[PDB]
Amino acid sequence: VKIKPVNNLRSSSSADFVSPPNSKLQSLIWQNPLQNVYITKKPWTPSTREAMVEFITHLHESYPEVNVIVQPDVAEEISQDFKSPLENDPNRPHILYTGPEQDIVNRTDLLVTLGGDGTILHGVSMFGNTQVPPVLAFALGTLGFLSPFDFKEHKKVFQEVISSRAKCLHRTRLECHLKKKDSNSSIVTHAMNDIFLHRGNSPHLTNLDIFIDGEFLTRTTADGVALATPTGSTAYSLSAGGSIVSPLVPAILMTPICPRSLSFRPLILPHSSHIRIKIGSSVVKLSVDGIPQQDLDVGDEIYVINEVKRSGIYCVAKTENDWIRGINELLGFNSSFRLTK
Amino acid sequence: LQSGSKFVKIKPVNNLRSSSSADFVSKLQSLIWQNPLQNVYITKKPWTPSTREAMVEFITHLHESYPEVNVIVQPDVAEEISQDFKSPLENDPNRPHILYTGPEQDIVNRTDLLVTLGGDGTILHGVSMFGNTQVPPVLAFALGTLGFLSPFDFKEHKKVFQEVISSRAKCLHRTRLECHLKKKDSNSSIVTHAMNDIFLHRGNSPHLTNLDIFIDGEFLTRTTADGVALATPTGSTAYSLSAGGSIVSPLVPAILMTPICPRSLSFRPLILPHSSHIRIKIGSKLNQKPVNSVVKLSVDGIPQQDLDVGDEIYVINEVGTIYIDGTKRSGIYCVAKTENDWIRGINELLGFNSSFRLTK
Amino acid sequence: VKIKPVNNLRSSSSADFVSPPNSKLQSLIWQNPLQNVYITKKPWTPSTREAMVEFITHLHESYPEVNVIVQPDVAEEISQDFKSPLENDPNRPHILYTGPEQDIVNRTDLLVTLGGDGTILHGVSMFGNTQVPPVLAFALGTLGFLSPFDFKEHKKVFQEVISSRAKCLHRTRLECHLKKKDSNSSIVTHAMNDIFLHRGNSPHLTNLDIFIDGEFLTRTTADGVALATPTGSTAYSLSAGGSIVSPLVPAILMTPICPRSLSFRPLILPHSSHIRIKIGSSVVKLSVDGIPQQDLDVGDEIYVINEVKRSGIYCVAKTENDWIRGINELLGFNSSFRLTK
Amino acid sequence: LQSGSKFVKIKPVNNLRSSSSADFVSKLQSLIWQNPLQNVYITKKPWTPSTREAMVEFITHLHESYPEVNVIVQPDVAEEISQDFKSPLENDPNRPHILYTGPEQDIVNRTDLLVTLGGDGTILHGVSMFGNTQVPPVLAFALGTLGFLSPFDFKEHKKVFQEVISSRAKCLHRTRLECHLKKKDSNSSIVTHAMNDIFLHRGNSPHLTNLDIFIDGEFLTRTTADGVALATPTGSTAYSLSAGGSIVSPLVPAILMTPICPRSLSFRPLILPHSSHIRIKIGSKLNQKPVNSVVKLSVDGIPQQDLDVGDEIYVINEVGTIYIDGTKRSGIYCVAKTENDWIRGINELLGFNSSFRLTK
Ligand SMILES: NC(=O)C1=CN([C@@H]2O[C@H](COP(=O)(O)OP(=O)(O)OC[C@H]3O[C@@H](n4cnc5c(N)ncnc54)[C@H](O)[C@@H]3O)[C@@H](O)[C@H]2O)C=CC1
Ligand SMILES: NC(=O)C1=CN([C@@H]2O[C@H](COP(=O)(O)OP(=O)(O)OC[C@H]3O[C@@H](n4cnc5c(N)ncnc54)[C@H](O)[C@@H]3O)[C@@H](O)[C@H]2O)C=CC1
Ligand SMILES: NC(=O)C1=CN([C@@H]2O[C@H](COP(=O)(O)OP(=O)(O)OC[C@H]3O[C@@H](n4cnc5c(N)ncnc54)[C@H](O)[C@@H]3O)[C@@H](O)[C@H]2O)C=CC1
Ligand SMILES: NC(=O)C1=CN([C@@H]2O[C@H](COP(=O)(O)OP(=O)(O)OC[C@H]3O[C@@H](n4cnc5c(N)ncnc54)[C@H](O)[C@@H]3O)[C@@H](O)[C@H]2O)C=CC1
Incomplete structure (x- = not known):
């Protein structure tokens, strides 16, 4: 050697x-x-x-x-x-x-x-x-x-x-853009499976304000929320009750993680969607493909898009x-x- | 008039x-x-x-x-x-x-x-x-x-x-989806078009349907159930929703496959590529009930026909189907x-x- | 012989x-x-x-x-x-x-x-x-x-x-008491598994008004509804998304069959519950342990209790x-x- | 004062x-x-x-x-x-x-x-x-x-x-439920009382919990998940509801067992007799992450302790437990x-x- x-x-x-054809x-x-x-x-x-x-x-x-x-x-x-x-x-x-x-x-x-x-x-x-x-x-x-x-x-x-x-x-893949209240620039991370927010160690539920293409979707009070690729549809999203999505489908999955709701049915969103999630009222953990990132405070945001080299x-x-x-x-x-x- | x-x-x-x-x-x-x-x-x-x-x-x-x-x-x-x-x-x-x-x-x-x-x-x-x-x-x-x-x-x-x-x-x-019905003992097809969905259901029959599902020519699964629904994203908020399916934006190119009251703990709803080729054949269990009128076919809620064991439906999107070898x-x-x-x-x-x- | x-x-x-003890x-x-x-x-x-x-x-x-x-x-x-x-x-x-x-x-x-x-x-x-x-x-x-x-x-x-x-x-077991609008008396049937109402052959959804112990619970527009014993929890109710209930639990299951709702979570009701379901606005099929009974019209009712010989x-x-x-x-x-x- | x-x-x-x-x-x-x-x-x-x-x-x-x-x-x-x-x-x-x-x-x-x-x-x-x-x-x-x-x-x-x-x-x-915590290498128990629920969760850990569940002394299943919740009927509308459980009238004598984000397609929530004896042991997969603080235990939402591989909880109703042989x-x-x-x-x-x- x-x-x-x-x-x-x-x-x-x-x-x-x-x-190739067919x-x-x-x-x-x-x-x-x-x-x-x-x-x-x-x-x-x-x-x-x-x-x-x-x-x-x-x-x-x-x-x-x-x-x-x-x-x-x-x-x-x-x-x-x-x-x-x-x-x-x-x-x-x-x-x-x-x-x-x-x-x-x-x-x-x-x-x-x-x-x-x-x-x-x-x-x-x-x-x-x-x-x-x-x-x-x-x-x-x-x-x-x-x-x-x-x-x-x-x-x-x-x-x-x-x-x-x-x-x-x-x-x-998805791109996660983290914008913390404190500092100047976004931290950008790529996900093959998912990007998720979770209460983690905290006994208190997350309160997340979710926006799609600039339009308010919903507030969720929950353990957390997962944004997944079709590849990621068989990972955390599946455990949380998501559908199984062929990796050939262009889409982004939004799957709630134990929500205080009877009606947060999982969503399948367009590939081109811009998703913004704001931490509302160390409260919330951020993970990318399961790897813990920075902890988030009230007022921090993630911005999630498909990777568009x-x-x-x-x-x-x-x-x-x-x-x-x-x-x-x-x-x-x-x-x-x-x-x- | x-x-x-x-x-x-x-x-x-x-x-x-x-x-x-x-x-x-x-x-x-x-x-x-x-x-x-x-x-x-x-x-x-x-x-x-x-x-x-x-x-x-x-x-x-x-x-x-x-x-x-x-x-x-x-x-x-x-x-x-x-x-x-x-x-x-x-x-x-x-x-x-x-x-x-x-x-x-x-x-x-x-x-x-x-x-x-x-x-x-x-x-x-x-x-x-x-x-x-x-x-x-x-x-x-x-x-x-x-x-x-x-x-x-x-x-x-x-x-x-x-x-x-x-x-x-x-x-x-x-x-839009296309449903191609191929009757048992027939080589012809009855074509219908769906904005919402295509579904099979036991309907009047007290017995469960037995359906063999093939995707792109490959056998996926046999389901024993009330039935199954194939839906557009538009139809994701219709029967498929009632059956536990996900809400799919009408801008997503996909076909939903959602089971209707299946005898299974593990038939999680599927989201398939718009290019998919879907074939469903009406089966039965060995020695059984009647073999005729065992399943109803509906397209956007409109009853088409009662189907018999051996009938098949083929379901594709109007445009963009990929036919892998073996399938205005x-x-x-x-x-x-x-x-x-x-x-x-x-x-x-x-x-x-x-x-x-x-x-x- | x-x-x-x-x-x-x-x-x-x-x-x-x-x-016997234990x-x-x-x-x-x-x-x-x-x-x-x-x-x-x-x-x-x-x-x-x-x-x-x-x-x-x-x-x-x-x-x-x-x-x-x-x-x-x-x-x-x-x-x-x-x-x-x-x-x-x-x-x-x-x-x-x-x-x-x-x-x-x-x-x-x-x-x-x-x-x-x-x-x-x-x-x-x-x-x-x-x-x-x-x-x-x-x-x-x-x-x-x-x-x-x-x-x-x-x-x-x-x-x-x-x-x-x-x-x-x-x-x-459950007892089903069918009261049709037309006639004088109830038809009584016993269920080991379930009693269910379903649109069956009809392309139109059932509209059912559900009462518990004389109190209005809900209107459901659906394929149907199943009332099950714990024994029946593994039968139709399970297919419809119900929980698995040990046969030692005293309870009645109420499990919707494909409801037009995001929030009809299955219910587990007391053993002593009196359940009345009215057919609201040949529209609806009634089955007991899977065996078709009389077809029901708008205004007909079933009354369901546990069997109390x-x-x-x-x-x-x-x-x-x-x-x-x-x-x-x-x-x-x-x-x-x-x-x- | x-x-x-x-x-x-x-x-x-x-x-x-x-x-x-x-x-x-x-x-x-x-x-x-x-x-x-x-x-x-x-x-x-x-x-x-x-x-x-x-x-x-x-x-x-x-x-x-x-x-x-x-x-x-x-x-x-x-x-x-x-x-x-x-x-x-x-x-x-x-x-x-x-x-x-x-x-x-x-x-x-x-x-x-x-x-x-x-x-x-x-x-x-x-x-x-x-x-x-x-x-x-x-x-x-x-x-x-x-x-x-x-x-x-x-x-x-x-x-x-x-x-x-x-x-x-x-x-x-x-x-009310009773949670009996028996630490690894201990024969003593820490007893807590629950109006809502008792639950195990991966919490701060990025890895899934591996839990072996026994009912009445018989092995039920191993689950690999975020965790699991044991709930009273009162607690059926709490964490268990969020995790997909059924709504259970507080007049029903039962214990709910509801998985929290399980790696399974078939862990349908269970409804158990009030008389049930439930034991859950913290396991692991062969050659792994850390073996300490792998799971958090909470009782009515209050964090009790981080638990280690080998710890067990025993969960029973306050009254009416039936102990089959092998278990004011x-x-x-x-x-x-x-x-x-x-x-x-x-x-x-x-x-x-x-x-x-x-x-x-
Ligand atoms: N299901 C749950 O409750 C949780 C799941 N996760 C998943 O773990 C993933 C990270 O994977 P690892 O680095 O292996 O960590 P890992 O070993 O902690 O957990 C991953 C588990 O998920 C499986 N898995 C991972 N990606 C998958 C996929 N795309 N489809 C189907 N199964 C998949 C792995 O084989 C393994 O069984 C995260 O992206 C997240 O999706 C993370 C936390 C909780
Ligand atoms: N949810 C269920 O249990 C059943 C639903 N259907 C749906 O009925 C549809 C036919 O519609 P109609 O001719 O109005 O018959 P309909 O009046 O018997 O059923 C339609 C019900 O579903 C709603 N609906 C239909 N399409 C929808 C969509 N894309 N999104 C949200 N809601 C929708 C309608 O507003 C109505 O409340 C079929 O395509 C099938 O999807 C048919 C049988 C059962
Ligand atoms: N799951 C579904 O979509 C439907 C289920 N059924 C069930 O069929 C039952 C009648 O049983 P059969 O006379 O054998 O008719 P069957 O042969 O038509 O269907 C019964 C199927 O359910 C199974 N089954 C019956 N009772 C069960 C139970 N308590 N737990 C678990 N599985 C059970 C049977 O083994 C068989 O696989 C009805 O009480 C109803 O619960 C009826 C219609 C639809
Ligand atoms: N749903 C979820 O994702 C989570 C729920 N919890 C629940 O929090 C409970 C502790 O309550 P708090 O001290 O208020 O902490 P909390 O304020 O962090 O959580 C309680 C949330 O659940 C609701 N809740 C609690 N018990 C309920 C019940 N029996 N029925 C309906 N809703 C109920 C409360 O109103 C509040 O909205 C725990 O027993 C657990 O069941 C704990 C963690 C996560």
Whole structure:
């Protein structure tokens, strides 16, 4: 194993996305060859560690041109896990490119995740405002919803990816603009799942004034409220009683979290909606994709829109019908009562 | 057809010129008449005095104020209301009120504007006439018991019609669904068009429907239930709402799939892409009740047919369906009152998120 | 096989029910020996037919004192199914007692069901206003919710029953009093599950005025409304969004069926409630335990109370915790999302 | 304790006689005083002018009209309101307003009647004082922002108190739950009493709670969620309602089990027998986040403790629990306004089954 600085590699090369006739998905076409592959994994998890080693071994064996990128602390963790050099000659060790977060962000052509939903969410968030490279997600360890591929098929799947034969689902994201009373500027954060406000530690209910496109919608006194992407419709929003929304639908979900109301039916809003929520009368917690942000005081506001740089997240898909299969087999959608045995 | 007054003449609607499709310049679309507005088709909720009175009053206004305007009504309505006009135009007995009428196909071809006098059902049946063709703009006045869709009080009719004819009105676009019924032992299809919804229901039968649902050629689920509803966003506030569905803005491109009293704890309502291809086949359980008339099919509330085990419906949006391997202006334009009709409608008419009593 | 008239048998002997300390159930104590056993089965169903033969064979073999009662058309159907007489001597054929419905009702000590929920419901309804004998329910064919026993354990279970060692769950029933505008008197019907009003064949919504103990509750415009026992809480009421209510709770459920309202949350009402529902402005169908009754016109009324003759239905229970097990294993209660494989 | 006026004397509540438990002759129970009503404990919503004003006005009325009556308030309240009395009794400077006060245990032993001035929280905290003992009858006046439980406007206080003291009032019985907290590595229990509910919640933690639920010693389910609520019928209109629970009449003997934002499509709310034995153990998933402070426990909204993996709560009704093998007047009596407070409350305060707008 040899650790090298990632700053030796060229900046990210963009892929092209085309919508073929009678497809729900976008063809992933590498206009310049794929080279910079960043691999992230669920930490402190044996199966993701072993799968990473095995995936990198496979890449170094089968794809000389591919440069493997990992985090610094990860490169240290897995260096001892490789023993046999390439084709068993001591002159080709396993080259791991690594460096500061920004260097990785600037150079990544393809993001590969080994783990669950958290792994994808945190990998994608690392990119901040840089357009996100395509995401190839393998499910390892405890199951989540978003990763379509079993690690066992990693060789066949990656071959389709690098050969411009794979297709991607486009997942839209929300932008959260936080405006606190005190200071000058907005803090902007991107959400794959959701942005939510919650009483959290406080025993007192939130009082939220909700505006759509400048028009007052409603006051809600509640545990909180969730604004979700269609991707996020299966996450917190689903727990709170929301509908399941195919990731192909352009929309924003507004789902109340335990409201003092008999009639706050969940809303499905247009993609282009501008949502403003004002904290009315440390009272309220703000979270983006589950990660706590600043605490909000009475008078603070969030402004939420769809992300409009190529926007959104392109995730390699297994089939044209991944969503159907996921809701059935992962979420237990419309499970039949037992009719025999 | 016999008029019940010498002050009314009933004339063939084929005496009128073909429809002038308007322009829609653009979240609301401006309604701008390329050819001037002339042929106004008026429908009303039947057997309700207020709407018959409103129709006569509206037609009187058009005949008084807009000489270029031609009034079209249904044949039975023409006969019904003919005795209600108690004077000719401008006190001149040689200028009777003229009402144009004829068969649907004749009316459909010549309508520039649909005006409805009644409730939600009035709009639904009116638009339903224009199923296989282009729907003219829809001007909807609420009379009698309130519904959700008609944005105007009939009291406002002079000022609203004024704005419409002068090309100063704006419209909300509402999408339409297509239901294709394919009977067991048939390769033909019966096509219907939906503004609200398409639904299957056990109806008169005491036994639950058993329905196999396929999306984009893939099997989704079997449901055993009262039935299932497929709804436009417009229809999200209708049957689908009653069945526990989400409220969907009419600007969202989606199809709702909402179960009706399912034997399941986990049939959460689904929101599907507007591009979806939906097939529902009427099934049964092994050795059973009757296999005929086990399910009723309705489209915008209108019973179509009882269906048998083996029948299928195919449901798609009017435009933009994606057919994955293994499977004329569109939509409806409704004259809007404000740029915020939707939020105000859900709040004031449906009581969306009504606060618990906080004072007094 | 020999067919005999059931009118040769004594009238029904009642069992005694005692609530032992630290039990949820009622001990079934035969004060006079159990003798008259009426067996009913889901019709046109091979497995129930074969199980009936096998159960009767077992009774004639092991319990000389037991008299087997079946329906006339059933006695004809199964007579050919027996071939071997008792202990293979031609002088003891299989004695089947049968006769008119009322004779069976008057003489039954124990009702045995072989089938599903429908079998129990229709067997129990046969008794009209006569107090219902204890019910021993075996699940055969397609699964339903109410029968706690697998037919395979029929010998062990019946031995506990006849030996006064079994325990019963007491299920309460509702009484429906139908008062049509036209005529003089009420038609009274008993419900194990529910009484419901529904638009049925009509495309027009029902308009129902609901009164509790003489006080106006609400007008509902809807597909309909269901009034359910706790037993019925897992039936139609559950499909309509009702809560799952243990059969030990004294209560009446009022669950709207697709109401034109955002705020008709299902209600749980006191056991002693008097519920009156008036049909407001062939418009409305009435069903009791799923069986269509008379059609109702505007101005007709139903009056619904708990049945107050020993009241209710005593069903032989398998364990103290049948309800937990049924909701988990039959209804898929709180099914976990897939966490592995 | 220092009074802020020579017109008020603050006296030890132990100067008063032990409580007189009333009689409850019998769906409402008549409140008939065996010993005459004397010791009136008054609580108010803190830091709200209307309730401080109401307290002074109520106490003034008692002192003017009922010489036999003794007023008990909290120690800090006695000091707070002492400066608010601007005259002595009957203009006699030798007859100051007397306010009795002391520690909870002292107050609890001597209260004939609890009077609350505020909202739902005021009742909850007031009743909470009488946890391990008998709860005196509760007379609840609504001041400030409306809640659900207080049936009387404070304006009505003279006429209502008149009915109560003269043994002409009626009360609704509300049952209480007991929460037994058994810490990990402990065999002792911390007991609390609930009028509304007992709930577990992730609170400050960003991770979901993992809770193992046992009923009557049998494992029911593991839930991964924000949390779970166990509620009385009284509490069915509180947190449980917000979480999607059914509205349960306070005359039904039951315990509600309602999930709070569960990771499941099938955790339908449960209604359990009042006799039920409920145990909930704080679990975790294999190799995880922190194991401490993973869940908050609240009882009637009051945070008790952060709980750790391995802690358990046991929840039972105050009376009538059945313990299947392997596992003083009770309840709360609230003075009622009419024989139909419940139907009127759900309709008028909660907007139960609010009709869509049908006219105007
Ligand atoms: N359901 C609930 O009561 C709560 C849910 N959350 C969700 O956790 C999400 C963060 O995910 P993690 O980083 O894994 O944190 P995590 O491990 O704390 O919780 C996430 C749980 O939700 C699942 N999940 C996440 N995204 C999903 C999606 N799009 N569809 C279906 N299931 C999904 C995960 O697989 C995991 O089971 C937040 O975006 C929020 O939606 C956060 C708080 C409460
Ligand atoms: N909620 C329920 O239980 C049922 C509802 N329906 C609805 O009736 C519709 C047909 O309408 P009508 O001819 O007036 O028959 P209708 O008068 O029998 O039913 C219409 C009821 O639903 C309301 N409605 C209809 N469309 C609506 C919409 N888009 N948003 C909000 N409310 C709406 C109407 O105002 C009226 O109160 C069908 O498309 C179906 O959606 C049909 C059967 C049952
Ligand atoms: N869920 C729905 O949409 C509808 C349900 N029903 C139910 O059918 C019941 C009559 O039962 P059957 O004679 O078997 O007719 P059935 O065969 O037509 O339908 C009954 C279905 O409900 C199940 N079921 C019946 N009682 C149940 C209970 N107490 N708990 C859980 N599941 C139960 C049966 O096993 C069967 O799956 C009626 O009392 C009514 O509750 C009737 C119409 C519609
Ligand atoms: N709905 C929600 O999202 C939450 C509700 N709560 C409720 O707060 C209760 C504590 O009450 P407070 O001390 O006033 O704190 P609070 O003022 O923070 O919450 C009480 C809110 O719930 C209402 N409420 C309380 N009990 C009720 C009941 N039995 N029926 C109808 N409404 C009721 C109150 O009027 C008030 O609007 C707890 O027992 C819990 O049930 C606590 C947290 C969240």
